[model samples]
Target: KPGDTFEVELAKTDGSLGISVTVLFDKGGVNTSVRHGGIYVKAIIPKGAAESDGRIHKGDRVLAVNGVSLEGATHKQAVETLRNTGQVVHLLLEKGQVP
Candidate 1:
């Protein structure tokens, strides 16, 4: 089967000051790059979801999700977590791998 990498989308709730969350995927072959390797936190956005928005990009490794380490994560686990999030997902991303 053609599996895809799970990704996330951040947006505001219908009528709340908080943000809404949705887990989406690249399906396949949405290769991306950046001038740097670290993800812009205040401006962090999911790859495909934020391309037009002009913020997040590819190769940006998220160190943590909601403050949880992403280093030892599995695809299924990551997808599940992303699908079910609260008001925020505090990510600790790096431009690239930490040395």
Candidate 2:
């Protein structure tokens, strides 16, 4: 299903800062590596998270966040950036193969 996609938006409201989903990490809590060299969607937990909605899936590549490009970012950099996003986080992803 090429062109299939979804978006995850983490909004800061009521003095609360929270993410709608969890990302994939290695066994030791390090960022997972991706052969395609983009920040890959490893996991999305939380019932109302975007991935949980079933449009975004594991293995999709996140290319940007809130208009910030992650094209050449390392796993760590991408994670750090995602964490620092302010009121709104717009995750731009490239969908992977369907399971």
Candidate 3:
């Protein structure tokens, strides 16, 4: 489905947030090094991942994950937080313009 825009919130299942998404970073292994503060989306892989449902996209700014804001999160910090987000990965995304 294309040209469809909407909002969604997917909670983790049985202590697992099954998804494979990429992020943009300056010094990290990202699809690209383009961003505007916070960890930005470079790609959303995994056909059946949460983003595959069509609510997320590249260039989308990941403001927070699991209630923890990535405002000034470093590469290590973002990775650490995202990985330790037991079961539920709450993501707050901002589309279009970077905030």
Candidate 4:
């Protein structure tokens, strides 16, 4: 089951592809916030970029990575995770919001 449209900002590496996708307004109409962990992430297969693994996409706000909330993470920690992840990654996404 999927909802919105989005695109990934590609990084230059081959082994570890880095990206932080921009999330548009959600279906429930909530403002973007830093403290709420409104982020989502999922893993992509090594050799299949177009396979559609149901990971993060547009309108999905990442709430956590590896079970660590983005609101609790420093900007540095968040940056590094987005930069150096390999094999597996985790993201908590906001699919629905309270209007």
Candidate 5:
């Protein structure tokens, strides 16, 4: 099974998207980690754009932002994308974890 990609259009919304993520910036193959650093949807506020979408779920891993890939992006780099991409966010999320 796999997670579905969803495009959310929340442009001009009155408030914030109310979505927060957990950023992991770890190097791969050198330690007990393999994620290589990525972003995960940690929490979604109720009645928010993300919750209203219904496609977004907890533990969903963010693979990309708009059209930029976060595969190997660092913490600040990844956070900046989501932070700046406030209104319109086109992203790829995988339910649960990735391989």
Candidate 6:
């Protein structure tokens, strides 16, 4: 069955999301890749905004930043979107396993 997606709102502390994103198919592949699409969240930084909210998690796919969808978008596009998002951000995420 398909799982539903949810939104996570994060407030920047010192201007950071406190989490890393790995685009599945960046640059045609970094050491190669898998199931490319949305930006995927890495483990929490513990000391950053992501952890403060205690909602985002590793292997969760970030479907959008604000209202723009990242589905099948380039890694650079995703980077810019996340980079330009200021202060508070609403992240659309879907829980999944990274193979």
User: Top TM-score: which candidate number?
Assistant: 6
Clash pairs, model 6 backbone = none
| Residues 1-99, model 2: lDDT tens digits | 454444556444433223222343343322225433445666555444443345555556566786677766776677688668765557776665433
Ten residues in a row with the worst lDDT in model 5?
Answer: 25-34
* Model 5: per-residue Cα lDDT over 1-99, one tens digit each: 345555444332546555666665233421215435456666777646677766665556676777687876764576687668766667765554423
Q: Candidate 6 residues 1-99, lDDT tens each?
A: 123477778778875777677666354532225655677776667667887887776667777887688877765677677778888888787764544
**Cα lDDT, all candidates:** 0.36, 0.54, 0.53, 0.44, 0.59, 0.69
List pairs with backbone clashes in candidate 3: 15-87
Q: On residues 1-99, what C-alpha lDDT tens digit does candidate 4 reach at each position?
A: 343333333333355433334333344434444434344333333433213354433335555555555664544566466566555454444553222
Misplaced by over 4 Å in model 3 are 1-36, 97-99
Q: In lDDT terms, how accurate is model 4?
A: 0.44
Which order, best to worst by lDDT? 6, 5, 2, 3, 4, 1
Candidate 1 weakest ten by summed lDDT = 15-24
RMSD, candidate 3, Å: 6.4
Candidate 1: residue 79 Cα off by (Å): 2.2
lDDT tens readout by residue for model 3, 1-99: 232222336444443433333344455423223534666656555544455456566556666775677767764576577678654456766562322
Least accurate 10 contiguous residues by lDDT in model 3: 1-10
lDDT of 1 by residue, 1-99 (tens): 111222334332432212122121233312223221222222333332334333234344444466665544554454445446554334454442111
lDDT of 2: 0.54
Clashes of each: 3, 0, 1, 9, 0, 0
Misplaced by over 4 Å in model 4 are 1-19, 22-37, 40-51, 72-79, 96-99
